[PDB]
Amino acid sequence: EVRSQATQDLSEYYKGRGFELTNVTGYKYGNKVTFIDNSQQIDVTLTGNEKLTVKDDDEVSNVDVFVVREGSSAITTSIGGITKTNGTQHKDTVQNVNLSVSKSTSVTSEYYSIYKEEISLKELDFKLRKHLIDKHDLYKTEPKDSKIRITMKNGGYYTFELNKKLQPHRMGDTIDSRNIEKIEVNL
Numbered sequence: 001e002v003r004s005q006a007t008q009d010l011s012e013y014y015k016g017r018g019f020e021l022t023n024v025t026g027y028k029y030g031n032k033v034t035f036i037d038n039s040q041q042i043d044v045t046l047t048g049n050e051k052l053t054v055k056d057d058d059e060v061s062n063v064d065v066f067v068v069r070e071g072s073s074a075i076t077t078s079i080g081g082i083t084k085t086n087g088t089q090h091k092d093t094v095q096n097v098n099l100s101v102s103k104s105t106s107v108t109s110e111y112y113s114i115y116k117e118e119i120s121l122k123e124l125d126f127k128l129r130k131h132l133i134d135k136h137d138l139y140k141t142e143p144k145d146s147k148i149r150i151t152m153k154n155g156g157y158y159t160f161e162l163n164k165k166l167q168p169h170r171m172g173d174t175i176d177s178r179n180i181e182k183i184e185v186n187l
């Protein structure tokens, strides 16, 4: 089967390294929050839709950061993915969500385990697409109108269109994982 350079670039991006900083402190200047992890500087661009506790100063503490390097380079540029750190200390799942994957004539069901109380669409999108690449042949073929839909316990839903990266402006969007009803993917 056919796969374009566009599909190959989606695959290279979502098979790349995404990592977490847990309960860290960073410093805001303008629309960037800078974190130091080991000796590495990480500058995270804010989107303006973050769900952060209101502060007086430039200190952003008690946050988790899901980091995905864009580009190559000394400083690591990442977009969004800052969330409140977990109140709990148990390290086990906070929610176990029904995940269905439809293909073309068949449906596969499994549970998808979420470890964070408040989680970015950035991290959900990244980890789910990586899981779909590893186990469900995502990007072996042209994705076309393939979508992930995250439905919330109040009936609202979010859509990730799999034929393009998640739009940068949405990467700060944050949800309470206890409110996720189900995840449905049509491939």
Ligand SMILES: [Cl-]
Binding pocket: 157, 158, 159, 160
């Ligand atoms: Cl959406």
Ligand SMILES: [Cl-]
Binding pocket: 174, 175, 176, 177, 179
């Ligand atoms: Cl929510």
